[PDB]
């Protein structure tokens, strides 16, 4: 009975747009929305409503508010089972977290691809375009913890576990194309670099202390992947506008059994955008949950994240032709030289029911393929296939890790593996070995094959001696770096020289700052420069003096490596805050939000209080947040219609949400009196960002859209150092 | 690599017919709620591709992946690792006792409605029918040990009730060793191997549990059950199961009845004897594990009657022992065992891990109806058995582990832990909520499907750590045991006490039991004594024994065999052949050992074929030496060419060992030159059955003494026969 | 409580049967040698030490369970006591996947003369140059609970405490192993296990799947041989050979490699059971090569390999 | 016991006591002490029953609850004194 009668309580299963209702399990939020693997659920799926309480094992529960005690203010007694069995399942609630993207937030979804692909892989999940896989992603940061921010200056994995028809393929990817290190053998060096130090455990989620940037200087290798982290692409304004990569070269493996090298890509359809670092660091403080929410709300929205599965691909007797080593995963392929073609489309449009059952036990393995697909020597990748199936022994408690709901494939298993903690499985097969006359040999093996064939390697060709050695074909490290920098827009890259000045600043040894700057004289002059003048540091006459690394394969520059040189924005499921005053004119808010509406933008409405607010012709208008509640951190634009603009005009946190949003290069736009809000934010014939007009007009909604579309106002930079906020 | 046959039939088959199976295959119509629920995670195998557990198609399931044949292994080889990792961690704890156990499934019924004393919903109906799964145990060994040896036993049944689990979790005797659960560990770890060395494996002869017995006289009457027969019984279908502790049971009104539990084999009560028990530790180590498999394939279904002693909570002083002191019985002369209901197991399970291994019992786990008193073995036990589940299965989860999940509904605020399986979709996991209306909501106590409410009990005292004075005599339960027990039964109970301590490294250790066993009989301490060439001093010889319980002077429920109770059905009889049988006698014996369900295995000096006198073909099920005498209840002999197996080795042991284990024997015709090997007289004896053919007389006699389960008149003449 | 005598065992050899068995550091105090010597700071006394908790707090009664009066229920608050119960529940960890069944002791090894002609290998390198070692031997089948004298193969596993880092040489008691492959030791090891139905038979390969698997693999048979014979029983772990099985390599300080195997010669010669014998002493004392190792070394009848 | 993966987690350095600490205690997951007491069980004569249980006493004695006097029935119920 303690329900609200107006039903209040329970959100509607319709899609809503963020704010609008209490987010809910996915199977409660959408039951219509459905999938092999979401189907396959339902078989562990608890309910609630109209059930008795009880012990885990159905004995009802007559008194959930009490030990049971020998008398009223008596001792506890040990012989209270219902008491022990509830204490002791919430004792033992926790597992160890995962060593790395301890910190992720997932999704259900599907995949299709455009065509089938048979000619260049015997894959079955890219055999045809009407074969739809379920898919589960799981986006995350890399250093901190479960509990830390999402919006961290930090690379961002990007996981996708396709269920498919002949197995389960694990892509574990991250958003940059590169990573640190080349040889899996550092990995626990350049983790322990990164993650906090080993006396104090100090800092979460941030690379800026010393023994990162230590082991950065002494590990030129590293210079690319840290170019990519100290970019924009470092923070991004949500998962749904990152890029994935495979990262490794992998193989395909057609039915002929010829072998196709391949780089695997996620392309957002949604376009690329980024946070500034000012407003990142802010968001961790204000929303530590910032990518968590966005990303679950946009789904419960409709505004269903996509991505599109992109090839790189090479022909085996092409492996030598670039100025980098295929198998070295410090180098990127740039797309001038080897084009990305479109494979499939990745919707993601339902959430999960519960985050520990499904997000928190899934478990990858990028050794996880199928027949038509292949590994290659890149000694990076062929370090991660023994640790992902090593570490779940102790994360997911046992070998049984498969048998968890979530990880289960949709095709069938059969095996003579037997036993280990928490089997699921009663096995019927008399028989628990193979060779085997008493079942007859079943399950038995399937010869390789275009289709349903048994697992079989490429055949590839190894010669030379055991040796602990890295390829001189490896020993290149400025090069890259430089090609990332030069296809940067001049704003992206100040933001790279702020970046490396910021962390830097961070590190307390000045000898590791000199080195680092060290470093970047051997990437390019200018920007090692910029980030010496920022941390009083001058470069001596042999630094400059450092000759450039060469082009890459003669490019000068590849723009598919900049977020925004290539515009590709799009403005679905973006929001815009509004700010009400007392006696808002109700025509501007009516265009205002018809015209997003239109758009799919979403809007919140921000007071300097709760509840409701009135407009001029009498219309209730209920109130999201308040201006500290949910700040300009969180928001993509800000509105202020016309009304009673004394009412805001002096409020301190209202002048300060337009000043936060003004820094950050959000697009403003100001209706009417809205405009006397320009002083604050020293604007009087206007400027370019601050969309204004006597009412909003739709010329108006038209101006603040098409700004939106571009993400940030670049050409307000210059201003920004003036502004205090 | 394929089939010749292999398979089983799917029908009941006598032990050796054929190959066993799991239950679902050798039984598939065999059904209960229980059983039909684990469907869900039942897994074929025929005519599926082997694969990954990541559902991935394997070509070549007989090579590693290395850089040329004879090459190094690669580490990219995912086929090899996973299957390698699943086998590097199969294994898991075994429990700290009870280690070594044998389960199968079954279904319990009531008689006849008992909510006039308790509102408990599985003896609410007669027609309510309640599917169990029962674990058997020993207490000592690790989970590699041997059935046989001289240990108590474990009896441990899962209800799975419509309003929950009920855990029955009972011992084969009425009480145990210690009274207060504080001494668990110092029981325990001095009955386990020794620290040091960790010897000995499943026996209580050392030094370190006879030294604990010595100082701990509330041991002594479990002492005396385990020194008994009690402590090898012949298989688990024919041993009595008890609860032990008082326990109580609540009716719709709250009024509470003092309960104790038993379990009545039908099958009867029989054991071996020490010689053969010890011997059979070694010939088959798993043979009551496979006695009860075959014996549930055979269709002799283990069948128990539960019993109730009553007792009214006005009565709980009425005895001169503490109804809740576990190291004290109910005689059943005081307080009659009341039939309840029977329990009949009829599946085996599919996969011994998989559902023996994993399955989780606990005496906490209780049902509205019941409840618990303030016996302090029982109090601590409360705590532990969910306490070890943590680390044995691996986290709180271990009621997701199908054989342990209920049939009835279970819905909570419980969240997370290692390998969650249930995925909750409640917007709430706290009550109370108003996001879900407060659902899953708690339940009133009433008469049926109410919550769990404790009966009202009344406490009064200080905190203490004391043991209470009505709990301090140790004497009057042994003796009553001893002069309970038939002379023959007492002569088997001096041989354990002089076996084990004769293996007492420490005589001062020797002599202390002595000194205990005078406080409970004199003939019984001076027997043992004489064993070990100990003399009683004058001191000794006057003590005065211990006090009637309640004027009993002996109890005969206490004995295995003062009422007979035996039923052969499921019996095994060993028939000895010759290379020309008889065809006439062994058409007969196979006809009234079916008549009355006792199976038969034909033994020869090898394996393979013999031809009868009249051209039958008879399959050899195994050799004399490979299934001895200790693996059957009887030994026949027909006639045939009797000189083919008079003057082997293997022929002659056979009834050697069978007449020193007082098994029945029967020779027909020229087998009768055989009582020469056991020096029989020309005229015979009880206990050897002859005749010039086996004829229907000759079978009576045959199936009489089986009844009678051993010829117990043999023993004097047993000790001089060398066997 | 002890007899005022003091024959509650003297710390000097004695043969089996004459004394009880002891701790090592008890029985043989003056046997030393260099990681037995750093075992110190983790061993526990016990005389002249009061009971205590974990936490080091003393025990009064460890006799009772506090509970709310003389026969009240026992209290939650009771921290002595559900320490002691919890330490008790969780006793257990996983047993061996194999070799479950094993008897160790600690021991020294040293060779007879240099070898650095062949290896660099720190332990090898000057005669009579003292390495620590810890020896278990094993079944291979049988659970920790199950029976020393069962017809297996035996487990032959040294640790090697060098200078240079530890060397575990892991050895069974015959000269070849049952599979060529690592791909297929848990098909192999499945088959001879007890069956997965009924968990039947324990410490034996005499059943259907172990020679339904030696039948259609017969790589397996040379093993076989060696199992069916009375190396499958020894009379002791002092009386059986020791087998590294696989080739390694020796190398030395020039980088020149030699293919090596690797043996232990038992100083007390080879010696087996009969089968008949064997199979009832599994019977009369599961513990027979495990109590025989034990009383040797009381005995100073030492296991000597070389 | 799951956190610091077995009862022996007081043998963790940071967690071990600095005075003695000697019981019946044996085994567990990752074990450190090795104890040498022949007994593993109380009462024992074998080591002549050490370790030994100390009296209550005003300095080195042994833990005993204070005896606080229980009066009441078996119920889960909240004093109506809390409310
Ligand atoms: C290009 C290089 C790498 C990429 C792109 C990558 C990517 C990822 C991603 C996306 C995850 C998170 C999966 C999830 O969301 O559950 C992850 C986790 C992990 N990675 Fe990596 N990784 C790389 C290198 C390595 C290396 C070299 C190691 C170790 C050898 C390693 C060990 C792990 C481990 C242990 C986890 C946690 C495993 C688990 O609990 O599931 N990674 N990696
Ligand atoms: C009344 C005397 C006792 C009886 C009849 C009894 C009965 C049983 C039985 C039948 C089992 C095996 C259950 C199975 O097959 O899984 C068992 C196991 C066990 N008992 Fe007892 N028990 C008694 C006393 C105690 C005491 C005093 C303790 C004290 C803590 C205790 C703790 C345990 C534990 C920890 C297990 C292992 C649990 C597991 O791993 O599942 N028992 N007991
Ligand atoms: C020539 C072949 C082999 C020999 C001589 C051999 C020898 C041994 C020995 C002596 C032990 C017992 C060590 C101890 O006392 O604790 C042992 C244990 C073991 N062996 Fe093997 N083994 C062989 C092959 C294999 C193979 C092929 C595998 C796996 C692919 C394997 C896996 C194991 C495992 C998992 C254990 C348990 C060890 C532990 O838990 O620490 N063995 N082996």
Request: net charge negative; with cysteine.
């Amino acid at each position: 009975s303690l329900a609200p009668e107006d039903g209040s309580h329970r959100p509607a299963a319709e899609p809503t747009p963020p704010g609008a209702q209490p987010t809910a399990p996915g199977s409660l939020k959408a039951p219509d929305t459905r999938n092999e693997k979401l189907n396959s659920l339902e078989d562990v799926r608890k309910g609630s409503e109209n059930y008795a309480l009880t012990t885990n094992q159905g004995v009802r529960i007559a008194d959930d508010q009490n030990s049971l005690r020998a008398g009223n203010r008596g001792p506890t007694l040990l012989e209270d089972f219902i008491l022990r069995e509830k204490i002791t399942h919430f004792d033992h609630e926790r597992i160890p977290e995962r060593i790395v993207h301890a910190r992720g937030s997932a999704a259900h979804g599907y995949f299709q691809p455009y065509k089938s692909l048979s000619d260049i892989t015997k894959a079955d999940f890219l055999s045809d375009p009407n074969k739809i896989t379920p898919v589960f992603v799981r986006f995350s940061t890399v250093q901190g913890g479960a509990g830390s921010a999402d919006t961290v200056r930090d690379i961002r994995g990007f996981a996708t576990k396709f269920y498919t028809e002949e197995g389960i393929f694990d892509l574990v990817g991250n958003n940059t194309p590169i990573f640190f290190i080349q040889d899996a053998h550092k990995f626990p060096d350049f983790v322990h670099a990164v993650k906090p130090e080993p006396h104090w455990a100090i800092p979460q989620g941030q690379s800026a202390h010393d023994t990162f940037w230590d082991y950065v200087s002494l590990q030129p290798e590293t210079l690319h992947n840290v170019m990519w982290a100290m970019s924009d692409r470092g923070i991004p304004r949500s998962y749904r506008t990152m890029e994935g990569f495979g990262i490794h070269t992998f193989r395909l493996i057609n039915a002929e059994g010829k072998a196709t090298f391949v780089r695997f890509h996620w392309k957002p359809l949604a376009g690329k955008a980024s946070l500034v670092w000012d407003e990142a660091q802010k968001l961790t403080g204000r929303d530590p949950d910032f990518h968590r929410r966005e990303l679950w709300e946009a789904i419960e929205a409709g505004d269903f994240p996509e991505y599109e599965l992109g090839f790189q691909l090479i022909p085996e007797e092409d492996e030598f032709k670039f100025d980098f080593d295929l198998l070295d995963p410090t180098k990127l392929i740039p797309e001038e030289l080897v084009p990305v073609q479109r494979v499939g489309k990745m919707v993601l449009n339902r959430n999960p029911d519960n985050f520990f059952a499904e997000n928190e036990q899934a478990a990858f393995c990028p050794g996880h393929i199928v027949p038509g697909l292949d590994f290659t020597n890149d000694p990076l990748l062929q370090g991660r296939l023994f640790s992902y199936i090593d570490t779940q022994i102790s994360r997911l408690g046992g070998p049984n890790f498969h048998e968890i709901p979530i990880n289960r494939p949709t095709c069938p298993y059969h095996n003579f593996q037997r036993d280990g903690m928490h089997r699921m499985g009663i096995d019927t097969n008399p028989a628990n070995y193979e060779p085997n006359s008493i079942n007859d040999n079943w399950p038995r093996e399937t010869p390789p094959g275009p289709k349903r064939g048994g697992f079989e390697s490429y055949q590839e060709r190894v010669e030379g001696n055991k040796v602990r050695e890295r390829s001189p074909s490896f020993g290149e490290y400025y090069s890259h770096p430089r090609l990332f920098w030069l296809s940067q827009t001049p704003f992206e890259q100040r933001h790279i020289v702020d970046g490396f000045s910021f962390e830097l600043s961070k590190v307390v040894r000045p000898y590791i700052r000199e080195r680092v700057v060290d470093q970047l004289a051997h990437i390019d002059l200018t920007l090692a420069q910029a980030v010496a003048k920022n941390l009083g540091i001058e470069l001596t006459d042999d630094q400059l003096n450092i000759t450039p690394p060469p082009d890459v394969n003669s490019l000068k520059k590849d723009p598919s490596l900049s977020l925004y040189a290539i515009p590709d924005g799009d403005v679905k499921g973006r929001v815009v805050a509004i700010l009400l005053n007392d006696e808002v004119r109700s025509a501007d808010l009516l265009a205002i939000l018809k015209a997003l509406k239109a758009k799919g933008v979403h809007a919140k409405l921000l007071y300097s209080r709760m509840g409701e607010v009135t407009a001029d012709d009498g219309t209730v208008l209920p109130i999201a947040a308040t201006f500290a509640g949910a700040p300009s951190l969180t928001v993509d634009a800000v509105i202020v219609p016309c009304g009673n603009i004394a009412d805001i005009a002096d409020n301190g946190d209202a002048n300060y949400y337009l000043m936060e949003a003004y820094k950050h290069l959000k697009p403003i736009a100001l209706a009417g009196d809205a405009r006397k809000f320009k002083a604050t934010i020293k604007v009087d014939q206007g400027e370019e960002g601050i969309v204004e007009a006597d009412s909003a007009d739709g010329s108006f909604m038209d101006e603040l859209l098409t700004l939106m579309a571009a993400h940030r106002v670049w050409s307000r930079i210059p201003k920004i150092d003036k502004i205090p906020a």
